[PDB]
Coordinates of C-alpha atoms and ligand atoms in Angstrom, one line a residue:
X12 CA 3.3 23.1 31.4
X13 CA 2.2 22.6 27.7
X14 CA -1.4 22.9 29.4
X15 CA -2.1 26.4 28.7
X16 CA -1.5 26.3 24.8
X17 CA -4.4 23.3 24.8
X18 CA -7.4 24.0 23.0
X19 CA -9.1 21.1 22.7
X20 CA -8.8 18.2 24.5
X21 CA -7.1 18.5 27.6
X22 CA -3.4 17.2 28.7
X23 CA -4.5 15.8 31.8
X24 CA -7.4 13.4 29.5
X25 CA -3.9 11.1 28.5
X26 CA -2.7 8.5 29.5
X27 CA 0.5 8.9 30.7
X28 CA 3.1 8.4 27.9
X29 CA 1.1 10.2 25.5
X30 CA 1.0 13.0 27.3
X31 CA 5.3 12.7 27.6
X32 CA 5.5 12.0 24.4
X33 CA 3.0 15.2 23.1
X34 CA 4.8 18.2 25.9
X35 CA 8.3 16.6 25.1
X36 CA 7.7 17.5 20.9
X37 CA 5.3 20.9 21.9
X38 CA 8.8 22.0 24.2
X39 CA 10.9 21.3 20.9
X40 CA 8.8 22.4 17.9
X41 CA 6.9 24.9 20.1
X42 CA 3.4 24.7 18.7
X43 CA 1.1 27.7 19.2
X44 CA -2.3 25.7 20.3
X45 CA -2.6 21.6 20.9
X46 CA -5.9 20.8 19.2
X47 CA -6.3 17.4 21.4
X48 CA -8.4 15.6 17.9
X49 CA -12.1 13.7 19.5
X50 CA -12.5 11.5 15.3
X51 CA -16.3 13.2 15.8
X52 CA -18.4 14.5 12.2
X53 CA -18.4 18.5 14.0
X54 CA -14.4 18.7 14.4
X55 CA -14.1 16.7 11.0
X56 CA -16.7 19.0 8.9
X57 CA -15.6 22.7 10.7
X58 CA -12.1 21.8 9.6
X59 CA -12.7 21.7 6.2
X60 CA -14.9 23.8 6.2
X61 CA -11.9 26.5 8.1
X62 CA -9.3 25.2 4.7
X63 CA -11.6 25.8 2.6
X64 CA -11.5 29.9 3.8
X65 CA -8.3 30.1 4.4
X66 CA -7.8 28.2 0.3
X67 CA -6.0 24.6 1.3
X68 CA -9.3 22.3 -0.2
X69 CA -12.1 23.7 -2.0
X70 CA -15.7 22.1 -1.8
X71 CA -17.0 19.6 -4.9
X72 CA -20.0 21.6 -5.5
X73 CA -21.3 18.5 -7.2
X74 CA -20.8 15.7 -4.7
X75 CA -22.3 15.2 -1.0
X76 CA -19.6 16.7 1.2
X77 CA -16.4 15.7 -1.4
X78 CA -12.9 18.6 -1.5
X79 CA -10.0 18.6 -3.7
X80 CA -7.5 20.1 -2.4
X81 CA -4.8 20.6 -5.2
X82 CA -0.6 20.8 -3.7
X83 CA 2.5 22.3 -4.1
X84 CA 4.2 20.4 -7.8
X85 CA 7.4 19.9 -5.7
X86 CA 5.4 17.7 -3.7
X87 CA 3.1 15.2 -5.3
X88 CA 4.9 12.2 -4.3
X89 CA 6.5 9.6 -1.5
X90 CA 10.2 10.5 -2.2
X91 CA 12.3 6.6 -1.4
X92 CA 15.8 9.0 -1.9
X93 CA 14.4 10.7 1.2
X94 CA 12.7 7.5 3.5
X95 CA 14.6 5.9 5.9
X96 CA 15.5 3.6 8.6
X97 CA 17.6 3.7 11.6
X98 CA 19.5 0.7 13.4
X99 CA 22.0 0.2 15.0
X100 CA 23.8 -2.1 12.6
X101 CA 23.2 -1.1 8.5
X102 CA 22.7 -4.6 8.4
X103 CA 19.3 -5.4 10.2
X104 CA 17.4 -2.9 8.1
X105 CA 19.8 -4.0 4.9
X106 CA 20.9 -6.8 3.2
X107 CA 25.1 -5.7 2.3
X108 CA 24.9 -6.0 -1.2
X109 CA 27.7 -7.0 -3.8
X110 CA 27.5 -4.1 -5.7
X111 CA 27.3 -1.4 -2.9
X112 CA 24.4 -0.4 -3.6
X113 CA 21.8 -2.1 -1.9
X114 CA 17.4 -1.9 -4.2
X115 CA 16.2 -2.8 -0.7
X116 CA 15.8 0.1 1.4
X117 CA 17.3 2.8 2.9
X118 CA 19.7 3.3 6.3
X119 CA 21.3 5.8 8.2
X120 CA 22.5 6.0 11.6
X121 CA 21.6 7.3 14.6
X122 CA 24.6 10.3 14.6
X123 CA 23.7 11.4 11.6
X124 CA 20.0 11.1 12.1
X125 CA 20.2 13.2 15.0
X126 CA 22.0 16.2 13.1
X127 CA 19.1 15.8 10.5
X128 CA 16.6 15.6 13.4
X129 CA 17.6 19.3 14.9
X130 CA 18.7 20.3 11.9
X131 CA 14.9 20.5 10.8
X132 CA 12.1 20.1 14.1
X133 CA 13.4 22.9 16.3
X134 CA 10.3 25.4 16.3
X135 CA 9.2 23.9 13.1
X136 CA 5.9 24.4 14.0
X137 CA 5.7 27.5 15.8
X138 CA 2.7 30.1 14.4
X139 CA 1.0 27.1 13.9
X140 CA -1.3 23.9 15.6
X141 CA 0.5 20.9 16.3
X142 CA -2.7 18.5 16.0
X143 CA -2.9 15.7 18.3
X144 CA -4.8 12.3 16.5
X145 CA -5.0 8.8 17.8
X146 CA -5.6 6.4 15.6
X147 CA -6.4 2.7 15.5
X148 CA -4.7 0.6 13.0
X149 CA -7.7 -1.6 12.4
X150 CA -11.0 -2.7 13.9
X151 CA -11.0 -1.1 17.4
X152 CA -10.9 -4.0 20.0
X153 CA -9.1 -6.9 17.6
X154 CA -6.4 -8.3 18.3
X155 CA -4.4 -7.8 15.3
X156 CA -4.5 -3.7 16.0
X157 CA -1.8 -1.4 17.0
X158 CA -2.6 2.7 17.6
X159 CA -0.1 5.3 17.2
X160 CA -0.9 9.0 18.4
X161 CA 0.6 11.4 15.3
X162 CA 1.6 14.7 16.2
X163 CA 1.3 16.8 12.7
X164 CA 0.7 20.9 11.7
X165 CA -1.5 19.9 8.7
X166 CA -5.4 20.1 9.1
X167 CA -4.9 18.1 5.8
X168 CA -3.1 14.7 7.7
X169 CA -6.1 15.6 10.0
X170 CA -9.1 15.3 7.3
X171 CA -7.3 12.5 5.9
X172 CA -6.3 10.2 8.8
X173 CA -10.2 10.6 9.5
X174 CA -10.8 8.7 6.7
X175 CA -7.7 6.4 6.4
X176 CA -7.3 5.2 10.0
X177 CA -10.2 4.8 13.2
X178 CA -9.9 8.2 14.3
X179 CA -10.4 10.2 18.4
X180 CA -11.6 9.5 21.6
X181 CA -12.5 6.1 21.4
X182 CA -8.5 5.1 20.7
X183 CA -7.4 7.2 23.8
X184 CA -9.7 5.3 25.8
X185 CA -9.1 2.2 24.3
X186 CA -5.1 2.6 25.2
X187 CA -5.0 3.5 28.4
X188 CA -1.6 2.7 29.5
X189 CA -1.1 0.5 26.4
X190 CA 2.2 0.7 23.5
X191 CA 1.4 2.5 20.8
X192 CA 3.2 4.2 17.8
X193 CA 5.0 8.1 18.6
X194 CA 4.1 9.2 14.3
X195 CA 6.0 12.8 14.3
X196 CA 4.7 14.8 11.0
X197 CA 6.0 18.6 9.9
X198 CA 5.1 19.8 6.8
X199 CA 8.5 21.8 7.8
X200 CA 7.3 25.9 7.5
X201 CA 7.5 27.7 11.6
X202 CA 5.9 31.0 10.6
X203 CA 6.5 33.3 10.3
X204 CA 7.4 32.1 6.4
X205 CA 10.8 32.3 5.3
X206 CA 10.0 31.3 1.8
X207 CA 6.7 31.7 -0.6
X208 CA 4.2 29.7 -0.3
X209 CA 3.4 28.0 -3.5
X210 CA -0.3 27.0 -4.4
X211 CA -1.2 27.4 -0.3
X212 CA 1.0 24.5 0.6
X213 CA 2.9 24.2 2.9
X214 CA 6.1 21.8 1.6
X215 CA 9.8 21.8 2.9
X216 CA 11.2 19.6 0.0
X217 CA 14.8 20.2 0.3
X218 CA 15.3 19.2 4.0
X219 CA 12.1 16.3 2.8
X220 CA 12.7 13.2 5.5
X221 CA 11.3 10.4 6.0
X222 CA 12.5 8.0 8.7
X223 CA 11.6 5.1 10.7
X224 CA 12.7 4.2 14.4
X225 CA 12.2 0.6 15.1
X226 CA 14.0 0.1 18.2
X227 CA 12.7 2.9 19.3
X228 CA 8.5 2.4 17.9
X229 CA 8.7 6.3 16.3
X230 CA 7.8 7.5 13.1
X231 CA 9.5 10.6 12.6
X232 CA 8.6 12.6 8.7
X233 CA 9.6 16.4 8.2
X234 CA 8.8 18.7 4.7
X235 CA 6.1 16.7 2.9
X236 CA 2.2 17.4 3.3
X237 CA 1.7 14.7 0.7
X238 CA 0.2 10.9 1.3
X239 CA 2.9 7.9 2.5
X240 CA 5.0 11.0 3.4
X241 CA 2.7 12.1 5.6
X242 CA -0.3 10.1 6.7
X243 CA 2.1 8.3 9.0
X244 CA -0.4 5.2 9.3
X245 CA -0.3 4.4 5.5
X246 CA 3.2 2.9 5.4
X247 CA 5.2 4.2 7.7
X248 CA 3.5 1.8 10.3
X249 CA 0.8 -0.3 8.2
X250 CA 4.3 -1.5 6.1
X251 CA 8.2 -0.7 7.4
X252 CA 7.0 -0.3 11.3
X253 CA 5.3 -3.1 11.2
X254 CA 6.8 -5.4 9.0
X255 CA 9.8 -5.0 12.1
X256 CA 7.1 -5.4 14.8
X257 CA 5.2 -8.1 12.9
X258 CA 9.3 -10.3 12.6
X259 CA 9.1 -10.0 16.4
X260 CA 6.0 -11.3 17.4
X261 CA 4.5 -13.6 14.4
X262 CA 2.5 -12.9 11.7
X263 CA 3.1 -10.8 8.7
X264 CA 3.1 -7.3 7.3
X265 CA 2.3 -7.0 3.6
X266 CA 1.2 -5.3 0.7
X267 CA -1.6 -6.8 -0.1
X268 CA -5.1 -6.7 -1.4
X269 CA -8.1 -8.4 0.5
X270 CA -10.5 -9.9 -0.7
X271 CA -13.3 -12.4 -0.3
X272 CA -15.0 -14.5 -3.2
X273 CA -18.2 -17.0 -2.9
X274 CA -18.7 -19.9 -5.7
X275 CA -22.8 -21.3 -6.8
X276 CA -23.1 -23.2 -3.9
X277 CA -22.2 -20.2 -0.8
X278 CA -18.5 -21.3 -0.4
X279 CA -16.9 -18.3 1.1
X280 CA -12.7 -17.7 -0.1
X281 CA -11.0 -14.9 1.6
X282 CA -7.3 -14.6 -1.3
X283 CA -4.3 -12.3 -0.4
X284 CA -2.6 -10.8 -3.5
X285 CA 0.7 -8.9 -4.0
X286 CA 1.1 -6.4 -7.0
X287 CA 3.8 -3.4 -6.9
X288 CA 1.6 0.4 -7.8
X289 CA -0.5 0.6 -11.0
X290 CA -0.5 -3.1 -11.2
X291 CA -4.2 -3.4 -10.4
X292 CA -4.7 -4.1 -6.7
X293 CA -7.3 -2.1 -6.3
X294 CA -9.4 -2.8 -9.6
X295 CA -9.0 -6.5 -8.3
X296 CA -10.0 -6.1 -5.1
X297 CA -13.1 -3.6 -6.0
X298 CA -13.9 -6.0 -9.1
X299 CA -16.6 -5.9 -10.7
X300 CA -17.0 -10.7 -12.4
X301 CA -18.0 -10.8 -15.2
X302 CA -18.5 -14.4 -14.7
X303 CA -22.4 -16.3 -13.6
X304 CA -23.2 -16.9 -9.9
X305 CA -19.3 -14.7 -8.8
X306 CA -19.6 -12.4 -6.2
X307 CA -16.3 -10.4 -5.5
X308 CA -16.6 -8.6 -1.8
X309 CA -13.4 -5.8 -0.7
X310 CA -12.0 -6.7 2.7
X311 CA -9.1 -4.3 1.1
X312 CA -7.3 -3.2 -1.6
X313 CA -3.2 -1.9 0.3
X314 CA -2.3 -3.2 3.3
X315 CA -2.7 -7.2 5.0
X316 CA -2.0 -7.8 8.4
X317 CA -1.9 -11.8 8.9
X318 CA -1.5 -13.9 12.3
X319 CA -2.2 -17.7 12.5
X320 CA -4.4 -18.3 14.9
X321 CA -4.4 -21.0 16.8
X322 CA -5.7 -23.1 14.7
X323 CA -4.0 -22.1 11.9
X324 CA -5.6 -20.6 9.9
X325 CA -4.7 -17.6 8.5
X326 CA -6.7 -14.3 9.8
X327 CA -5.9 -11.5 8.0
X328 CA -7.2 -7.6 8.8
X329 CA -7.0 -4.8 6.7
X330 CA -5.1 -2.0 9.0
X331 CA -7.3 1.3 6.8
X332 CA -10.6 3.0 7.3
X333 CA -10.4 4.3 3.9
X334 CA -9.7 3.5 -0.3
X335 CA -6.0 5.9 -1.0
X336 CA -5.9 5.0 -4.2
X337 CA -4.9 6.1 -7.8
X338 CA -7.6 8.5 -9.7
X339 CA -6.1 8.1 -13.2
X340 CA -6.2 4.7 -15.0
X341 CA -10.1 4.6 -12.4
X342 CA -14.0 4.6 -14.6
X343 CA -16.9 2.7 -15.0
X344 CA -15.5 0.2 -17.7
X345 CA -12.2 -0.8 -15.6
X346 CA -13.4 0.0 -11.5
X347 CA -17.6 0.5 -11.7
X348 CA -17.2 0.3 -7.2
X349 CA -14.5 2.5 -7.1
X350 CA -16.2 5.6 -8.2
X351 CA -20.2 4.0 -6.9
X352 CA -17.3 4.5 -3.7
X353 CA -16.0 7.7 -4.3
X354 CA -18.7 10.4 -4.7
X355 CA -19.9 11.0 -1.2
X356 CA -17.2 12.0 1.4
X357 CA -14.0 11.7 -0.2
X358 CA -10.6 14.3 -0.4
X359 CA -9.3 14.5 -4.0
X360 CA -5.6 15.8 -4.4
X361 CA -4.2 17.2 -7.2
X362 CA -6.9 15.4 -10.1
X363 CA -9.1 17.9 -12.1
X364 CA -11.5 19.2 -12.2
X365 CA -14.5 20.1 -14.4
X366 CA -16.7 23.2 -14.3
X367 CA -20.4 22.1 -12.9
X368 CA -18.1 21.5 -9.2
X369 CA -17.1 17.1 -11.2
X370 CA -14.0 15.7 -10.9
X371 CA -11.6 14.7 -13.7
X372 CA -8.3 12.4 -14.7
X373 CA -6.9 10.3 -17.4
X374 CA -9.0 7.0 -17.9
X375 CA -11.9 9.0 -16.6
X376 CA -14.3 7.4 -19.4
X377 CA -16.5 10.2 -18.6
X378 CA -17.8 11.5 -21.8
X379 CA -19.3 15.7 -20.3
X380 CA -21.6 17.5 -21.9
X381 CA -21.5 20.6 -24.4
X382 CA -20.2 23.0 -22.7
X383 CA -18.7 21.2 -19.5
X384 CA -15.0 23.4 -19.1
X385 CA -12.1 21.5 -17.7
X386 CA -9.1 22.3 -14.6
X387 CA -6.1 20.9 -14.9
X388 CA -5.3 20.1 -10.9
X389 CA -2.6 22.9 -11.4
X390 CA -5.2 25.6 -11.8
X391 CA -5.0 26.2 -15.0
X392 CA -8.0 25.8 -18.0
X393 CA -6.8 22.5 -19.8
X394 CA -8.1 21.1 -23.7
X395 CA -7.3 17.1 -24.8
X399 CA 0.2 16.8 -20.9
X400 CA -2.4 15.0 -18.6
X401 CA -5.3 17.1 -16.2
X402 CA -5.0 15.5 -13.3
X403 CA -0.9 14.2 -11.8
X404 CA -0.5 10.9 -12.8
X405 CA -0.7 9.9 -8.5
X406 CA -3.3 12.4 -8.1
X407 CA -5.5 10.7 -5.6
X408 CA -8.6 9.2 -4.1
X409 CA -9.0 9.2 0.0
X410 CA -12.4 7.4 0.9
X411 CA -13.7 5.8 3.6
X412 CA -13.8 2.5 3.4
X413 CA -17.6 1.7 4.9
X414 CA -18.7 2.3 1.7
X415 CA -17.4 0.5 -0.7
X416 CA -20.8 -0.8 -2.6
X417 CA -19.2 -4.2 -1.9
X418 CA -17.7 -4.0 1.4
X419 CA -17.1 -7.2 2.6
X420 CA -19.6 -8.5 6.1
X421 CA -16.6 -9.5 7.3
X422 CA -13.9 -6.4 7.0
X423 CA -13.7 -4.8 10.3
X424 CA -14.2 -8.4 12.1
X425 CA -11.5 -8.1 14.9
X426 CA -10.2 -11.7 14.7
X427 CA -9.9 -11.6 11.1
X428 CA -10.9 -13.2 7.5
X429 CA -9.1 -16.4 6.6
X430 CA -7.0 -16.4 4.1
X431 CA -6.5 -19.9 1.6
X432 CA -4.7 -18.3 -1.1
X433 CA -1.9 -16.1 -1.7
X434 CA -1.2 -14.1 -4.9
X435 CA 1.7 -12.5 -6.9
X436 CA 2.4 -10.5 -10.0
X437 CA 3.2 -7.3 -11.5
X438 CA 3.7 -6.1 -15.2
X439 CA 5.7 -8.3 -18.0
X440 CA 5.1 -7.9 -21.5
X441 CA 6.4 -11.3 -22.7
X442 CA 7.1 -14.7 -21.2
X443 CA 5.1 -15.7 -18.3
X444 CA 2.1 -16.5 -18.6
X445 CA -1.1 -15.3 -17.0
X446 CA -1.5 -17.9 -13.6
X447 CA 0.7 -20.3 -12.4
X448 CA 0.3 -21.7 -8.7
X449 CA 3.8 -22.4 -7.1
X450 CA 4.4 -26.3 -5.8
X451 CA 5.7 -25.7 -2.1
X452 CA 5.6 -22.9 -0.2
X453 CA 8.7 -23.1 0.6
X454 CA 8.7 -22.2 -4.1
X455 CA 6.3 -19.8 -3.7
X456 CA 8.0 -18.3 -0.5
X457 CA 10.8 -18.1 -3.8
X458 CA 8.2 -16.9 -6.7
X459 CA 7.5 -13.7 -5.0
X460 CA 10.3 -12.9 -4.2
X461 CA 11.5 -13.8 -7.6
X462 CA 9.2 -11.2 -8.7
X463 CA 9.8 -8.1 -11.2
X464 CA 7.7 -5.2 -13.0
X465 CA 7.2 -2.8 -15.5
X475 CA 10.9 1.2 -20.2
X476 CA 12.7 -1.3 -17.7
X477 CA 11.9 -4.3 -16.1
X478 CA 12.7 -3.8 -12.0
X479 CA 12.6 -6.2 -9.9
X480 CA 9.9 -5.7 -6.4
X481 CA 9.9 -8.3 -4.0
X482 CA 6.6 -9.8 -3.0
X483 CA 5.8 -6.0 -3.8
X484 CA 8.0 -4.7 -0.9
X485 CA 11.1 -3.3 -2.7
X486 CA 10.0 0.5 -1.4
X487 CA 8.6 -0.9 2.0
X488 CA 10.7 -3.7 4.5
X489 CA 11.7 -2.3 7.3
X490 CA 14.3 -5.0 8.4
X491 CA 16.7 -6.8 6.0
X492 CA 14.5 -8.7 3.1
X493 CA 17.0 -11.8 3.7
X494 CA 15.6 -11.9 7.6
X495 CA 12.6 -11.1 6.1
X496 CA 12.6 -13.7 3.4
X497 CA 13.6 -16.2 6.3
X498 CA 10.8 -15.0 8.3
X499 CA 8.2 -16.1 5.6
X500 CA 10.0 -19.5 5.3
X501 CA 9.5 -19.7 9.2
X502 CA 5.2 -20.3 9.2
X503 CA 5.5 -22.9 7.1
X504 CA 7.9 -25.1 10.8
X505 CA 4.6 -23.6 13.1
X506 CA 2.7 -27.4 13.3
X507 CA -0.5 -26.8 12.6
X508 CA -0.2 -23.8 10.0
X509 CA -2.4 -24.2 7.3
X510 CA -0.1 -22.4 4.7
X511 CA -2.5 -20.8 1.7
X512 CA -1.2 -21.4 -1.8
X513 CA 0.4 -19.0 -3.4
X514 CA -0.5 -18.2 -7.0
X515 CA 1.8 -15.5 -9.7
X516 CA -0.6 -13.2 -12.2
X517 CA -0.2 -11.7 -15.1
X518 CA -2.6 -9.5 -16.8
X519 CA -0.2 -7.5 -18.6
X520 CA 1.2 -10.6 -21.6
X521 CA 1.5 -8.7 -24.8
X522 CA 1.6 -9.7 -28.9
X523 CA 4.6 -8.4 -31.1
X524 CA 2.0 -5.2 -31.7
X525 CA 1.7 -4.4 -28.6
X526 CA -1.7 -5.4 -27.4
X527 CA -2.7 -7.2 -24.5
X528 CA -3.5 -10.7 -25.0
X529 CA -6.2 -10.2 -21.6
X530 CA -8.7 -8.5 -22.1
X531 CA -8.3 -8.1 -17.7
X532 CA -10.7 -6.3 -15.5
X533 CA -14.1 -8.1 -14.8
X534 CA -12.6 -11.1 -16.6
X535 CA -9.7 -12.1 -14.4
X536 CA -13.0 -13.8 -12.6
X537 CA -12.2 -16.6 -15.3
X538 CA -8.6 -16.5 -12.8
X539 CA -9.8 -16.7 -9.8
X540 CA -12.6 -19.3 -9.9
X541 CA -9.7 -21.8 -11.5
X542 CA -7.7 -21.2 -8.0
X543 CA -10.4 -21.5 -6.0
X544 CA -10.9 -24.3 -7.7
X545 CA -7.4 -25.4 -7.3
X546 CA -8.1 -24.7 -3.3
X547 CA -10.4 -26.7 -3.5
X548 CA -8.5 -29.6 -4.3
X549 CA -9.3 -30.3 -8.5
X550 CA -7.0 -31.9 -10.9
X551 CA -7.9 -28.7 -13.0
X552 CA -3.7 -28.5 -13.6
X553 CA -0.8 -29.6 -16.2
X554 CA 2.6 -29.4 -14.3
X555 CA 5.7 -27.0 -16.2
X556 CA 9.0 -26.4 -14.9
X557 CA 7.9 -23.1 -12.9
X558 CA 4.5 -24.8 -11.4
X559 CA 1.7 -25.4 -12.3
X560 CA -0.7 -24.4 -15.5
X561 CA -4.1 -24.2 -15.9
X562 CA -5.2 -27.7 -17.7
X563 CA -6.4 -27.3 -21.2
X564 CA -10.1 -25.7 -20.9
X565 CA -9.7 -25.9 -17.5
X566 CA -9.9 -21.9 -16.8
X567 CA -13.9 -20.6 -19.3
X568 CA -13.1 -18.3 -21.8
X569 CA -17.1 -18.4 -22.2
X570 CA -18.3 -15.0 -24.5
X571 CA -13.8 -13.6 -24.3
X572 CA -14.6 -15.0 -28.2
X573 CA -10.9 -16.7 -29.2
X574 CA -8.6 -14.8 -26.7
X575 CA -5.1 -16.2 -27.8
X576 CA -4.8 -19.3 -25.5
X577 CA -1.2 -20.6 -27.2
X578 CA 1.0 -18.0 -26.7
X579 CA -1.1 -16.2 -22.8
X580 CA 0.7 -19.6 -21.9
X581 CA 3.3 -20.2 -24.2
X582 CA 6.1 -20.8 -22.0
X583 CA 9.5 -20.5 -23.3
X584 CA 12.8 -22.2 -22.6
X585 CA 14.8 -19.0 -24.1
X586 CA 12.6 -16.3 -22.0
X587 CA 13.1 -18.3 -18.3
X588 CA 17.6 -19.7 -19.2
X589 CA 17.6 -15.6 -18.9
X590 CA 14.6 -15.3 -16.5
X591 CA 16.5 -17.4 -14.0
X592 CA 19.6 -16.4 -14.6
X593 CA 18.7 -12.7 -14.1
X594 CA 17.1 -13.9 -11.1
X595 CA 20.4 -15.6 -9.6
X596 CA 22.8 -12.7 -9.7
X597 CA 20.5 -9.7 -8.7
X598 CA 19.4 -12.5 -5.4
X599 CA 23.9 -12.8 -5.1
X600 CA 24.2 -9.2 -5.4
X601 CA 20.9 -7.9 -3.4
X602 CA 21.2 -10.2 -0.5
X603 CA 24.5 -12.2 -0.8
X604 CA 24.8 -14.1 3.2
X605 CA 20.9 -13.4 4.0
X606 CA 20.1 -15.5 1.1
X607 CA 18.0 -18.0 3.5
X608 CA 19.1 -21.4 1.9
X609 CA 15.6 -22.6 1.2
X610 CA 15.2 -19.3 -1.6
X611 CA 18.8 -21.0 -3.4
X612 CA 17.7 -23.8 -3.4
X613 CA 13.9 -23.4 -5.2
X614 CA 16.5 -21.1 -7.6
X615 CA 18.9 -24.4 -8.5
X616 CA 15.4 -26.6 -8.5
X617 CA 14.0 -24.3 -10.9
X618 CA 17.1 -23.4 -13.2
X619 CA 17.3 -26.9 -13.4
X620 CA 14.0 -27.7 -14.5
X621 CA 14.3 -24.5 -17.1
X622 CA 17.4 -26.8 -17.9
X623 CA 15.8 -30.4 -18.3
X624 CA 13.0 -28.5 -20.4
Ligands
GDP1 N1 -4.5 -4.0 -18.9 C1 -5.0 -4.2 -17.1 N2 -4.9 -3.3 -16.5 C2 -5.2 -3.3 -15.5 C3 -5.9 -4.3 -15.1 N3 -6.4 -3.9 -13.7 C4 -5.3 -2.6 -13.6 N4 -5.4 -2.4 -14.6 C5 -4.5 -1.0 -14.7 O1 -3.4 -1.0 -13.8 C6 -4.0 1.0 -13.1 C7 -3.0 1.2 -11.9 O2 -4.5 0.7 -11.3 P1 -4.9 -0.3 -9.6 O3 -5.9 -1.3 -9.7 O4 -4.7 1.5 -9.7 O5 -3.3 -0.6 -8.9 P2 -2.5 0.0 -7.4 O6 -1.9 0.9 -7.4 O7 -1.8 -1.6 -8.0 O8 -4.1 -0.4 -6.8 C8 -4.9 1.1 -13.9 O9 -4.9 2.1 -14.9 C9 -5.8 -0.1 -14.2 O10 -6.6 0.9 -15.5 C10 -5.6 -5.6 -16.0 O11 -6.4 -6.7 -15.3 N5 -5.7 -5.4 -17.3
MN2 MN1 -3.3 23.7 -3.1
MN3 MN1 -4.0 1.7 -4.9
MN4 MN1 12.4 -24.9 5.6

């Protein structure tokens, strides 16, 4: 009975399966104390203050309740090399690649994982508090939401989980005897410390291992205190575990923003968009449009859970409660309404701080006053190496977004009418095109490539598939064999085409409102499209380009046979090597069709 060690809550208060999970791991990890989180502002403020006194975070004097954490530099980002999925058979997790090295995931046997686990977790929380974090991915009471319990020895994880998920006692009461995902996390630094603690940031990079066990409904993560390694809702649950749950249960879990868009006659539409990291999801989800009369409202900027309802609409919820955005590059110009979002109640990690107690990063586009001096993310004075680590983050509540859609917490989700794919392509790929069918659109997602190297990132999910990517494609195709399904139109965009001198052909940012209106009108059925080998593109003058000056539209939409011949050959060899026997017939057929259309142009 670990009851004697409970310093907040009680083990008798917990659903019985939750108690077994806490007590079983308390016996293994041997924490000094067990703190069952209630989600209250009191608990949150007191924990931040404790971390402040211990030197784990600093208060940002300038802002209302904002905080800065600087990590050990060895613990600065997700490590795909150390991120694994455990299943009986490797092929259920990744297609067996012809070449022998899969780019589509990382499998570990159950035997190898048991060994790794036993080498890590016994005694790992000695001298530390085990925090029990009950949380909901999605609005409380939503039929699309799912519940997890995270055990962690990191107060930084507790505070960040309060922002990024719905957390606390209300979640426990709603859970009852229902099912939940078991999330176990340890920074891997029992006390007394065996190694020196760097930057007062507990970390264990040599034993870092982020493991997913879909068949046991468990995520087990060790040795990292950072971001997606430790906030186990952020990706481990939201994409890897959930995409397997989604396959079994008939829905989709995707690396997509969700935004609502309204035309000047009051008609709203919701779009989802899958871009890879650093290709502009957050910017587009919080866009300030440049075109009069248009309104963009943010539902989510990173994760979408989507399920066809009984009437055939694709209903999407944002299962997150906040935004864990990349800070560098965020500015007045590029994302003014992210700037509004983060100036209160926000945790920053690995960005710089100004003399006046503010935040600073590359691309912030903010002249400071003469005299204002800057301290780097490595806690050293800095003069124009970057000031902020490139993967530095803000962690902010979504409720604060000045354009948060009124339905962003609606338990039924919002109806998705268009899905957008895209990434960074400096050559060959036009600004926008539309897929010819659902099957072709799935192929477009599967073929996605993104930027001195161009790499495949199908569906923007390369690091996050919870199971075999060929079966994932089959799952997407199966949505069409579902009577009533109102299959959304699929588009592919490229903000990043360059001319021969390396300059961006498209100014982008809020000017992407001009591409979104075109998509709006195609969903409406407007005849604004010209058929091409890769799909539909906007007709002559269909795109509203007034105010933009003389955009060089010839090259921005130029489709070159020689380029697309190379593209389709590259895609064929990629899918053959990496997907092989698990490539669905329909995707191979779309590939043959594209190759044939290209050969005839
Ligand atoms: N050229 C151009 N750059 C963009 C655009 N949108 C975003 N970016 C840049 O892409 C980088 C990453 O953007 P972010 O929204 O954090 O992408 P995310 O990490 O995929 O959500 C930022 O430095 C932006 O300045 C655009 O429309 N055009
Ligand atoms: Mn620190
Ligand atoms: Mn983002
Ligand atoms: Mn089919």
